[PDB]
Amino acid sequence: KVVFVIRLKGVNKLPPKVRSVFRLLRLLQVHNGVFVKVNKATKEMLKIVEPYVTYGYPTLSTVRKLLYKRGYVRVGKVRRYARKKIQDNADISKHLGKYNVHGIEDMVYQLYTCGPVFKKVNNFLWAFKLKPPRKGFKAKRHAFNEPRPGDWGNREAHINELINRMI
């Protein structure tokens, strides 16, 4: 139902359709990760950017842990966002109060299960800008279904291992 998609390619020299998809995807910084709801249009968008992003299924412990350490939320106004670290429920109880998914565990729940309000919560959340990925990365070129090393493209469950390294 959900997929965590991590960009892993620079901003120089981008194809134009890929550039457009990146704007919609919201991976404007080269080490952004973001959650995406799997449907058919989203999968085709992911396909267009495929050699330049790694992606996979984010397990429930990982999703919480990443959200705990790197959770920021947009606390400003629509198209006048302000980026604040999430250290209490009151900020997000303001923003998500109408939707009733106020407080961080409910957001975590929506992320876990692909809940009834996914888009708005995702949209309120900042796109997670991640650390370089510790020991055992390597091979920026091509993609993971080449037998040779290189995490790029689909890596399913193994996304979590990569996320754990770059947390």
Binding site: G10, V11, R19, F22, L28, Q29, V30, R80
Partner: protein, 186 residues
């Protein structure tokens, strides 16, 4: 390196401050900025913006237009973010209570004579700080002399505008390109 358009900047356009050096107008924008910020009233916010706006682009209002607009209003308090000019083309009997940026001396005298009120912006702020039960008005732009001059080419076909022309003389701009007989017309 982030991919943001306009390098992520929000770039506001139009007036960023009032650029007048007039002490009274500087005092007035201080006042209306305070009144807008504290009240959070839309009426005050419009007044502040219109006070900041270019003095040239601030309009005259005709007295005939002011009366014509105020006709369905039994509350008498007109506010005008521009200058109120007099009328010499009709009887102009019915009085009003009008706050304006500037009054012509003849207009002011007529309004006062008729039993009206010519009201300062400080008096308006003091009496009516919320703007309730009042009428905000604007004079018209109505194609001023520059507007008549400009607007996507006068010499292009299917366009109505004034070029440079010095056409007080006789033998002025009427032929080739402006004439169906001589080559073609706009």
């Amino acid at each position: 390196g982030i991919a943001l358009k306009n390098v992520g900047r929000i770039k506001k356009h139009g007036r960023k401050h009032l650029v007048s050096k007039n002490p009274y107008l500087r005092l007035l924008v201080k006042l209306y900025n305070f009144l807008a910020r504290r009240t959070n009233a839309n009426f005050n916010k419009i007044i502040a913006k219109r006070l900041i706006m270019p003095k040239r682009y601030r309009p005259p209002l005709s007295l005939s237009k002011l009366q014509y607009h105020m006709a369905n209003h039994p509350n008498d308090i007109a506010v005008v973010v521009g200058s109120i000019t007099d009328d010499k083309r009709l009887f102009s009997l019915k009085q009003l209570k009008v706050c304006a940026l500037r009054f012509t001396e003849t207009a002011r005298k007529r309004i006062e004579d008729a039993g009206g009120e010519c009201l300062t912006f400080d008096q308006l702020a003091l009496k009516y700080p919320t703007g309730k039960k009042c009428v905000l008005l604007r004079g018209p732009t109505k194609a001023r002399t520059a507007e008549k001059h400009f607007g996507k080419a006068p010499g292009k076909p299917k366009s109505k505008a004034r070029p440079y022309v010095r056409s007080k003389g006789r033998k002025f701009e009427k032929a080739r390109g402006r004439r169906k007989s001589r080559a073609y017309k706009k």
